[PDB]
Every structure is written in C-alpha cells, then in structure tokens.
Design a protein around this ligand. Sequence first.
Ligand SMILES: CC(=O)N[C@@H]1[C@@H](O)[C@H](O[C@@H]2O[C@H](CO)[C@H](O)[C@H](O)[C@H]2O)[C@@H](CO)O[C@H]1O
Length: 137
Amino acid sequence: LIVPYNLPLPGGVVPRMLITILGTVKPNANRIALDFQRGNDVAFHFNPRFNENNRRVIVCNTKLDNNWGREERQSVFPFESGKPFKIQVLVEPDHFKVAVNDAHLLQYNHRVKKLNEISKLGISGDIDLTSASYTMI
Ligand SMILES: CC(=O)N[C@@H]1[C@@H](O)[C@H](O[C@@H]2O[C@H](CO)[C@H](O)[C@H](O)[C@H]2O)[C@@H](CO)O[C@H]1O
C-alpha cells in the first residue's frame, strides 16, 4: 500500500470496531502517524517519534479547527527501526484502545464525540505499509 494511505471507514467509527495495521518500520525512521479524521479535524492523532531530543516517544492529540490540543505522551515505545509491527486500534465507547504487537499500549479518551463522523484514517510516516483493515469483534 502506498503511504500516505487513506483508509475510508464507511459510516464512521463505532464501538467494537477493530482496525489492524501491519507494516515494517523503515531503517533510520523518524516518525509514524495515524490520523483519524472528521473532515478537516483530526479526532485522534497517534504519533510515534523516533528521535525527539534523542528520545523515543509516542504523542497523541486532537486537532480542532487547525489547532492542536493538549498532548498526551507515552514513554513505552514498542516500535523498532527496520522491524515489522502490528498496530490494532479497538474502538470502545469511551476510548480508542491501542495495542502494538499484541501488547496493550494506550487508551485515548474521545475528545471528538460524534464517532459516526470520524470516517477516514490517514496512515503516513517512515514505514512500508503491508496491510490496513478493519472488522467488528
Ligand atoms: C514538547 C512539545 O510540546 N512539543 C510540541 C510538538 O509536539 C508540536 O508538534 C506537533 O505536534 C502535533 C501533535 O500534538 C502533531 O504531531 C504535529 O505533526 C506536530 O508538528 C509542536 C507544534 O504544535 O509544538 C511543540 O512545542
């Protein structure tokens, strides 16, 4: 799949919806980004950064009307340059739950409440995208 890749989510997101992304981090990778979009707004921005002040950190945020909000940062960094990964985003009623390589990583409380209007997922960054899909559990 060509990155940046756009995965349309017909009818928006809904609890019990599971998105699975498989890929390989490029060697010398700098960043990865998943953008759950509601029109121009970004409902949930998941952004692993490989070198932020020589620190590997995951930044999560929401962008409303061209403005980024309060960042939520995670130190647990499970991605590795040059290695295959699997990211699963499970949509729950109150949060997006993220697990990487089968290990729960983080939860992101819904700032954008109209879930049915979050109808696109943008995937970009320094990765080789192998697969991107969704299902209902
Ligand atoms: C430490 C700190 O506050 N750093 C922020 C940067 O993280 C921020 O970068 C933007 O962050 C958003 C997510 O919040 C998104 O990843 C953008 O791509 C990225 O540019 C920057 C701009 O808001 O400000 C710094 O101070």
